[PDB]
Amino acid sequence: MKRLTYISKFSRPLSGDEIEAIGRISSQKNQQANVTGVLLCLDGIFFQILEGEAEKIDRIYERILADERHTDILCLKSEVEVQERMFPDWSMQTINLDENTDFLIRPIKVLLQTLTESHRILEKYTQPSIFKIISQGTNPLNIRPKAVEKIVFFSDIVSFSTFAEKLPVEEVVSVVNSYFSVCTAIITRQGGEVTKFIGDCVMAYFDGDCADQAIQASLDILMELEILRNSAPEGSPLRVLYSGIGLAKGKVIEGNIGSELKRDYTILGDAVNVAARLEALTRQLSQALVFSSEVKNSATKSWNFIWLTDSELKGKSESIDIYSIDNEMTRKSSGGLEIARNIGHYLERV
Amino acid sequence: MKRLTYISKFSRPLSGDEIEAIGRISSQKNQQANVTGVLLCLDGIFFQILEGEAEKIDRIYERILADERHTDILCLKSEVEVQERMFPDWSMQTINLDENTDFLIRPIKVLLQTLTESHRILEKYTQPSIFKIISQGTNPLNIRPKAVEKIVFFSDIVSFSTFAEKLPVEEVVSVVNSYFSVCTAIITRQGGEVTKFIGDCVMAYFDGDCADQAIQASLDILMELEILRNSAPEGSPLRVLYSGIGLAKGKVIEGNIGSELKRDYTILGDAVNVAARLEALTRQLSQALVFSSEVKNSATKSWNFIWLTDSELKGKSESIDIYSIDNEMTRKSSGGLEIARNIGHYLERV
Ligand SMILES: Cc1cc2nc3c(=O)[nH]c(=O)nc-3n(C[C@H](O)[C@H](O)[C@H](O)COP(=O)(O)O)c2cc1C
Numbered sequence: 279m280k281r282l283t284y285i286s287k288f289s290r291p292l293s294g295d296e297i298e299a300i301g302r303i304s305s306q307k308n309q310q311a312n313v314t315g316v317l318l319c320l321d322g323i324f325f326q327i328l329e330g331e332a333e334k335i336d337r338i339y340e341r342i343l344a345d346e347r348h349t350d351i352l353c354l355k356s357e358v359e360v361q362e363r364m365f366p367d368w369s370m371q372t373i374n375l376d377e378n379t380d381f382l383i384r385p386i387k388v389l390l391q392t393l394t395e396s397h398r399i400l401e402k403y404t405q406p407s408i409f410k411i412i413s414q415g416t417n418p419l420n421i422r423p424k425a426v427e428k429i430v431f432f433s434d435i436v437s438f439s440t441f442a443e444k445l446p447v448e449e450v451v452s453v454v455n456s457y458f459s460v461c462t463a464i465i466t467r468q469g470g471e472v473t474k475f476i477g478d479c480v481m482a483y484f485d486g487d488c489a490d491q492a493i494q495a496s497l498d499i500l501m502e503l504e505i506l507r508n509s510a511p512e513g514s515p516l517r518v519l520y521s522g523i524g525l526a527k528g529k530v531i532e533g534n535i536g537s538e539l540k541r542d543y544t545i546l547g548d549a550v551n552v553a554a555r556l557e558a559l560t561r562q563l564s565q566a567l568v569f570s571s572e573v574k575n576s577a578t579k580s581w582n583f584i585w586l587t588d589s590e591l592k593g594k595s596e597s598i599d600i601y602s603i604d605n606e607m608t609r610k611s612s613g614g615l616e617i618a619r620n621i622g623h624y625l626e627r628v
Numbered sequence: 629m630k631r632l633t634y635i636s637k638f639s640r641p642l643s644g645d646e647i648e649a650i651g652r653i654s655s656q657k658n659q660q661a662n663v664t665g666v667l668l669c670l671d672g673i674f675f676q677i678l679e680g681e682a683e684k685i686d687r688i689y690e691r692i693l694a695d696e697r698h699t700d701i702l703c704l705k706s707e708v709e710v711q712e713r714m715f716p717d718w719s720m721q722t723i724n725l726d727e728n729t730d731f732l733i734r735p736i737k738v739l740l741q742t743l744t745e746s747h748r749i750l751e752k753y754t755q756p757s758i759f760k761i762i763s764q765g766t767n768p769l770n771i772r773p774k775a776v777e778k779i780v781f782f783s784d785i786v787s788f789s790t791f792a793e794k795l796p797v798e799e800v801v802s803v804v805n806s807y808f809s810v811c812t813a814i815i816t817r818q819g820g821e822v823t824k825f826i827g828d829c830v831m832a833y834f835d836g837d838c839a840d841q842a843i844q845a846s847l848d849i850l851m852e853l854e855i856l857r858n859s860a861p862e863g864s865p866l867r868v869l870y871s872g873i874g875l876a877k878g879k880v881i882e883g884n885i886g887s888e889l890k891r892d893y894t895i896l897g898d899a900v901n902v903a904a905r906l907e908a909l910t911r912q913l914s915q916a917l918v919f920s921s922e923v924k925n926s927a928t929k930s931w932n933f934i935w936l937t938d939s940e941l942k943g944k945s946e947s948i949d950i951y952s953i954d955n956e957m958t959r960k961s962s963g964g965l966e967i968a969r970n971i972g973h974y975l976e977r978v
């Protein structure tokens with residue numbers, strides 16, 4: 279069997295009516311599915327454990343994930359090899375701790391709340407891959423390191439030092455965070471993982487056979503930033519927000535990397551360095567998107583590739599053929615590299 | 629008043645005897661201090677809330693932090709402006725949920741456990757600064773960005789690409805993690821903050837008036853790595869583990885930086901770039917530790933400074949005078965840059 283534990287937050291205040299309406303329907307649907315477990319209610323927070331056949335659990339959780347009466351739904355635990363039920367006589371016992379006033383319940387209830395709100399804080403500082411892994415039934419702490427092929431993505435804000443020199447600190451952070459949010463949303467939707475931010479830089483990666491999605495994600499970022507630039511208020515620093523992007527391909531190590539008290543689940547390898555060095559050349563090459571011939575040849579769609587140059591850094595003393603894609607968006611975004619050379623006056627006056 | 633909530637793990641199995649011995653003494657000491665609250669016991673895990681005068685709470689928590697009967701002690705919440713007690717009639721009610729078998733207690737107990745073990749996982753992926761902030765009574769999510777002077781620290785493993793080419797993936801990660809652990813331990817003890825790992829690189833920072841501690845931390849890292857090298861088993865990759873270190877000083881932005889779902893509490897600014905670019909020059913300059921004249925002049929101890937060169941990168945078209953310190957350890961560590969140029973054969977045979 280499968281057992282799922284999740285927490286969520288009320289989307290909006292819920293009445294006494296609506297809460298037992300939820301318990302009523304859940305218990306009826308679970309009874310029919312031979313699913314058991316507990317739904318707990320505490321100060322605008324839901325906790326639920328559900329157990330049964332994996333196929334039925336998955337369809338139930340799918341509806342739960344779509345229910346607009348709660349949000350911020352987070353799976354804390356997924357066990358997919360359960361031999362014995364934890365809550366057998368109850369299709370869906372609902373328990374409401376708000377109305378509760380039992381005696382040793384009161385200390386446990388404030389404990390539950392403080393643990394949950396502390397957990398919500400830590401969630402904001404946690405890589406999204408960690409919660410994905412947990413939702414697949416895997417403890418991330420026990421993943422062993424592996425060699426894997428990846429497409430590595432690296433991007434940054436053009437002339438970011440000008441933003442930091444000219445703007446108040448709150449506006450610098452607003453710009454960076456806006457940029458990071460655009461990139462993260464598109465990368466995640468295209469099947470990639472944003473694994474690190476460093477300075478105003480984004481490091482991300484895609485599966486090794488997903489060069490098409492990496493390229494499409496890069497073009498979508500450029501398109502979204504175009505929308506953001508031309509939709510921003512007059513005088514806004516967002517009007518001169520441009521990105522460079524570099525993609526590389528290679529075998530890297532994936533796993534838990536860090537000190538004893540603080541690790542990241544992330545990647546390590548030469549392709550990370552190549553992607554960052556290619557991204558650095560966007561300015562000199564007058565191309566907003568640059569990638570290696572290995573990325574180019576690994577792609578299977580008929581992108582309009584343009585050869586840029588043959589050069590190198592490193593390290594390994596090997597030359598690399600560098601490509602972009604030639605379309606209206608990359609031409610406009612590449613022109614933005616030039617524009618961003620002299621945005622100091624524009625930024626001085628926001 | 630002040631109210632503290634923390635969790636901990638048993639250091640070792642604790643008997644029925646020892647647990648009420650803890651409750652017995654705690655209740656007696658709290659009664660004398662006019663401290664109230666609750667200590668909860670659940671499957672080798674402690675939860676406690678304590679409330680009272682800040683000075684008495686701090687002295688009590690100090691003893692709790694020293695008690696070898698528990699470990700992994702983590703403050704989830706510190707409220708330092710409490711006007712009203714949450715648990716007034718009880719100096720230290722102790723509650724043991726293991727022995728408990730009440731009816732709606734059972735679902736809440738498995739909930740408490742799953743929340744706690746999920747929290748413990750997330751702790752391993754969380755910057756240490758976040759828990760420090762929480763322990764000071766501050767929610768990190770509501771810190772506003774600020775401009776602050778910092779000394780920025782950047783370091784990496786010399787010829788790391790050779791380790792990744794020659795060693796099995798498990799041994800590559802073991803080396804990197806060992807290095808990261810050495811650096812983090814020393815930096816934290818010297819009052820700094822390790823804020824990011826990228827590749828085999830460590831980024832950290834110290835208060836702007838703490839150049840002496842930054843320099844001492846750097847020298848201690850070099851000394852610890854010497855101990856690690858000369859103490860490692862024969863043939864071990866750790867025998868050829870060397871570091872470069874660069875320090876820079878400047879005004880940076882500190883605050884929450886990232887996408888909507890994932891942020892870091894970290895720094896942003898030119899001094900980060902300068903520190904990384906200085907660290908990159910360690911090889912060309914044949915000096916394991918390099919730093920800017922601003923770091924040099926900001927220090928107040930009589931380090932044996934040696935001027936290295938006048939050069940630049942950037943960006944800003946300004947030259948920088950680069951320094952090191954000349955002692956036996958930096959000479960030996962700098963010689964290690966040369967040794968690390970040709971460790972491929974040594975590493976091929978581990
Ligand atoms: C907090 C919460 C918990 C829920 N738990 C369950 C559940 O355990 N089983 C279930 O069938 N529906 C549960 N639901 C309701 C589903 O989201 C959905 O409303 C219902 O199952 C779909 O019914 P339908 O088959 O007519 O579409 C829950 C809803 C909420 C808000």
Ligand SMILES: Cc1cc2nc3c(=O)[nH]c(=O)nc-3n(C[C@H](O)[C@H](O)[C@H](O)COP(=O)(O)O)c2cc1C
Nearest residue numbers: 650653654657658674678688691692695697698720
């Ligand atoms: C889980 C746990 C909770 C404790 N809580 C308290 C407490 O609330 N108040 C207290 O005085 N001691 C508490 N202690 C015990 C202290 O660590 C320490 O043993 C004792 O207070 C010191 O007594 P002393 O003044 O003779 O040194 C706790 C110990 C443990 C293991």
